[PDB]
Design a protein around this ligand. Structure first.
Ligand SMILES: O=C(Cc1ccccc1)Nc1nnc(OC2CCN(c3nnc(NC(=O)Cc4ccccc4)s3)CC2)s1
Ligand SMILES: O=C(Cc1ccccc1)Nc1nnc(OC2CCN(c3nnc(NC(=O)Cc4ccccc4)s3)CC2)s1
Lengths: 410, 410, 410, 410
């Protein structure tokens, strides 16, 4: 018979008509959101159907078939456990417990150099997960908005390489980490910044994106890009943080003039204008939830997991994850790579963009920072997750000891 | 039916009586070598049958099963295309092309600071592949013995961590890469060597291994350990190279006394003694083939692909792969990391020990080195390998553009 | 039998009277100039005397005594070879041979990074000598005005210490050379610039001068201070150099913002304003002749030698010569300290301000610079000087080999 | 009218016959020691006169002449205040206050890294002055022998340059201070040690002295050289310190091999042989008194003040004072040069070898060191000396404010 109601008998159990509330509760348990863009046709029909028959609320064979025929491919995969994490309900409990285990880590100091980011209660703590199949889960303050800050750095690097290619972008900027407390330097021996993840590298990267338009079009061009990446979830902009960031980044200006004087920018660059653009991209706002989609886009070869849409070339995404692995956690990058072994990127607002390649993207957020600039709970969470799961970049898929593999059965 | 005669019809192909050579031929085409340890009881039963009447030999449903009972599970996986690389025959055609491509790169200079090394013709070039399922292929001078040199460093880090655990080992040696030209500073800021892949670190690591027995026992122990990792293929020792490496190795003696004075060795370490242990270890010999198994052991979570034996703990194997990633190719390390994205370790003899986690282990060998001391042909091969396949640590398993995935058939 | 009358007979030689030209010749050969401020009385009398009856042109013992009356003590020392260099007419011969030898050094590039220094002919070459007694000498292009540039660094440092003292000034700036490729860094291990002789230090020093008045007042102040130091010989300003230096000084802005960021300036500093004042100070013009007097004030413990006025404290002068010793010649400081062993300071305009303590002060000017930014002719000249005379600051006064001592009789 | 005569009635009274005790007392007051080698023929005669004509002890016009005639030139200069410091008795008062003021400085830790220096009481404190004319003064523990250690470094460099010239020696060793903390590096950018005053430099310089002879003869040759510099005062040897310094000198062996590897030693250099020679030179013993005579030879252009014997070339003496100036007090070198401005060399035994060129030499001794490695009382004394006297390199001889100048009379 048909795909469309092989799947029916599947959910229908023994009876002949599936309640609407049952089917929905099934769908939700596969971790799909009833607001999933890929499921719009089917949810709209259901809603239309609840209207045109108060008479209900149960779906027979053909009623079910005229709702799910629209998105039958994605609905089949979800219901037959063909997603990257099959028992997703089990998984999210573990996530919750990791969350609670972290929440108890009261250490750290809120970034206060800008008045805006000391307006956030330290209590706040959120984690959001988006799988490469569009499975979602959150716990904590995942709907509070904050600035990306340095979390934006791999995102705009990715745009450059997507628009300009590996070879060109790296005429201007390095690809290695700089060395334990080989820190205070701006350029390396070839008079390029060390990599996209440091400020000096980021600033140069900013100067390549959409060259030859003004700092309003460049800004919108990038937001368009991020909007696609986040499946059109929340992507705002705090100007309060921008005016503060600019009237305060003396160090950044030092970096600007230093790069100028050493001719690090492309020909015909307006350096002070790049600095405003840079301060702007730092002020872009996300929620845990929206960011986790973005991260999942990196986790998913560049295709946005909840829309299907190709946002980034594989070349861009691969390049980006490579530098997040080595340069992503300020002076904690070497330790984080050893013990965690995941691409991550931290920002001074308490955010940590985290990617488990081929599995999921995440965003942890908690304002209080440790001595190295990283979110304390965020760090504790990340070490826990890889203690529990074989997610380390050099964990084994076949032999992994006491760990748990969310990619498998029971 | 049963697993065994079921497999009989698969090789049969309409026919009545499966010829022996037809079985061997079909066996080889899966990747497995006729001499695989796990196929002992099968091959024995075969050589036994090859004498009940030395004219044939035609296995019926019964004689076939008698010869394949013992190993039916492996034989079934092999023939049902269940191995990590299902179409191995195809795959080794690409390996062979990649080999001829790199064969045309005659640049570089054979090491010569030791007489034992400029004896090697600059045209020696071998590639050996061993997959996590035991599949073998060699093209080139893969049975010529050469010294491991710095290629041994990840193997004795492994051993140490396997015997002593992470926390004890990394009291004495760091775990990050060092810095720009850094081949220079012998210690990080905590007065440990930077990582176990540089000479200061290796030397410390040698001093943690099997403490409190003499150098003769210690060496037997590492040998025994390498024999497990190489599935009992060729592991030797080159006393010539050992002598030449010692009477002409003042830099290692320099580091030794520096380490001793800053108190980097365990209590009661006879430093000069340790150096000679280290010199012996650099002079261990392997072949492309044998070493590619060792490399496949790291690919396979610490279990030897061609015996089944647990050789190293997951902690050891993961730690080693993390540090090879970032520290494994001398100054070229960060560039390797970015472009090739695989754990590898190189050696002044022309060896590059390469690991494709969960897929395979490898060992390339061409004596002529580039200006950073890395085999020219080897480097070229590794670039092409990843240019062609989605083996790069941050390629996507699902969206990989115009790359080939040897793990898939469909 | 007293004072002014011995001086009459020693010149008249028992002749009738004294021819006025004979006296001015005798005077000029002591090294003193006719325009010497300490002689203005004597000279003025002499010209007006040759009017009461110009019918002369002689001098009665009567007539004479009343002219030399006022300056008798100085005119006596001069004529009784009491000055620091007795045989001055012989010394100026060696200076001349030294000028001609250095003149044959074709080499160097003129500073062609700013249109005001590209301006200058490479063939320009001038040397001026002022002893601590006001004995003068010039040869070459010594009345052409040029910008001090970095030659102003010791001067403005001196002023700062003169006004605020050693302790306060050295809260904001260190007192050592940097390291011979710590040339690059801006701050030492205590977040102060390494010393006042380097652009970071100079800028900070600039912020210490006449704090809390505006940049026109501060500038006027330094100008007048430099006027004292040069016995009111030419001190100018080049607005052209000023505009250029500020259109083109991206590195200096880099340094400014770095310092502001690290809180190196005194509280309440307008950093952008201190940069302009700094640019202004570099754009100060002098001639060979006026500058050699400033160098002479340093050689003379802080008294201007041609006027007698206490310009700088001994503390200020000591301090300054200490740092010119070790930090004065850019990357060539160590090689200069060893071989010439004299306090000197060079600038991009081609100048070298050279001090021989307790003896003389000099200024060398030749616009073509070497690869380290020092004047080619200047450097050569300084080496020859100390090859000839026991002026090396660790030469012996009592045992000095094949060298010559301009301070001794025969 | 003879010098012998004039001097007689000079010391007379206008009188008859000088008492012997009145002559000796008068002689001591010029600072000269009764055992001056240049005074020996005269002192024998006095002692001999007291014995013979015991019927005295009044020396008349011809008895006196019979004594002082042998050494009349020097005895004149002594009594006619011709010596470098004319009022020497006044000067010793000052030294004595300086000594007492430093004596109240109980800070410091005595070196403990070998048992030989652990032993030394913390309160030992001695100062000795020898002028370039042989005027001596001691106060405190100045006859106790202690080891030169790094205080030998300037001495053996002087010997190298004396025998081999500047050009040779400085192939092998640099001539600049390392960096305000490049100390840990052994080699500069040209693969030479930074300067003679650091261990790597000292060791290379050791390897240049008397090449091609065994250590017995080499060591003699240096000892014979040291005796000449000290006018034959105490130059001993500590075998105890030798043995300890070798069976514990691991950092030096580190330096030794590094140096061998990078090929800093002259061809045919037995590296370990050189090390032992090095350890021996560091164990050469001196007293404050004998060391002050050595320092005085350096202060005197290479002539030994109390023998008049030419010990070193002026090229050697100049070169050493140069490097003592900028590299002498380990890491405190920059600070010392700025504040004290005299050439000095400190050692871990607590000595400070001090030179006031054209004036005097000095050894201060006091075993407790500061965190920098310098004798605490030593350092204190050096600052106070230059507070009090215009001996700073860049103090002015004509304008020195409120300082005292010991080179002038009333
Ligand atoms: O460190 C300290 C105090 C300190 C000192 C000692 C110990 C611990 C702390 N202060 C400063 N720290 N960073 C500074 O950066 C400044 C701005 C950019 N700079 C540069 N950035 N990048 C370069 N690199 C090449 O110019 C090329 C190169 C050549 C050779 C090796 C590496 C790089 S310079 C140089 C100056 S100032
Ligand atoms: O406590 C620490 C570590 C540390 C790290 C960070 C901060 C604070 C402390 N100790 C040490 N760590 N490494 C050391 O090196 C040793 C000493 C000299 N060596 C030499 N290395 N390199 C040379 N020669 C050029 O490096 C040539 C050169 C090139 C460019 C510029 C200057 C010199 S000698 C090799 C051995 S000592």
């Amino acid at each position: 018979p048909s795909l469309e109601d092989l799947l029916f008998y599947t959910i229908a159990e023994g009876q002949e008509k599936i309640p609407v509330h049952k089917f929905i509760t099934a769908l939700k348990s596969t971790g799909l959101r009833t607001s999933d863009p890929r499921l719009k046709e089917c949810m709209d029909m259901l809603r239309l159907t609840l209207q045109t028959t108060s008479d209900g609320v149960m779906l027979d064979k053909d009623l079910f078939k005229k709702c799910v025929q629209s998105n039958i491919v994605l609905l089949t995969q979800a219901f037959r456990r063909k997603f990257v994490i099959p028992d997703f309900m089990s998984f999210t409990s573990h996530i919750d417990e990791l969350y609670e285990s972290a929440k108890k880590q009261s250490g750290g100091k809120v970034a206060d150099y800008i008045p805006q980011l000391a307006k956030f209660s330290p209590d706040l703590w959120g984690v959001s997960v988006c799988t490469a199949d569009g499975q979602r889960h959150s716990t904590g303050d995942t709907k509070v908005p904050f600035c990306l800050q340095s979390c934006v750095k791999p995102l705009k690097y990715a745009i450059a390489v997507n628009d300009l290619g590996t070879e060109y972008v790296h005429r201007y900027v390095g690809k290695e980490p700089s060395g334990l407390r080989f820190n205070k330097l701006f350029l390396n021996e070839d008079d390029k910044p060390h990599n996209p993840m440091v400020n000096a590298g980021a600033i140069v990267v900013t100067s390549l994106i959409k060259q030859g338009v003004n700092n309003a079009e460049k800004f919108d061009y990038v937001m368009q890009f991020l909007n696609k990446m986040a499946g059109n979830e929340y992507v705002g902009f705090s100007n309060a943080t921008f005016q503060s960031e600019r009237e305060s980044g003396d160090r950044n200006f030092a970096i600007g003039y230093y790069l100028k004087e050493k001719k690090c920018f492309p020909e015909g660059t307006d350096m002070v204008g790049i600095l405003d653009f840079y301060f702007q991209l730092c002020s872009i706002e996300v929620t845990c939830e929206s960011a986790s989609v973005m991260a999942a886009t990196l986790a998913n070869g560049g295709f946005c997991p909840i829309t299907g849409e190709r946002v980034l070339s594989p070349e861009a995404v691969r390049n980006t994850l490579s530098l997040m692995h080595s340069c992503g956690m300020y002076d904690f990058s070497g330790q984080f790579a050893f013990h965690v072994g995941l691409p991550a990127k931290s920002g001074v607002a308490g955010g940590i963009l985290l990617v488990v390649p081929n599995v999921m993207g995440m965003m942890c957020w908690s304002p209080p920072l440790d001595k190295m600039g990283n979110s304390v709970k965020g760090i504790h969470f990340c070490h826990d997750l890889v203690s529990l799961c074989n997610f380390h970049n050099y964990d084994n898929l076949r032999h992994f000891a006491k760990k748990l593999d969310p990619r498998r059965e029971g």
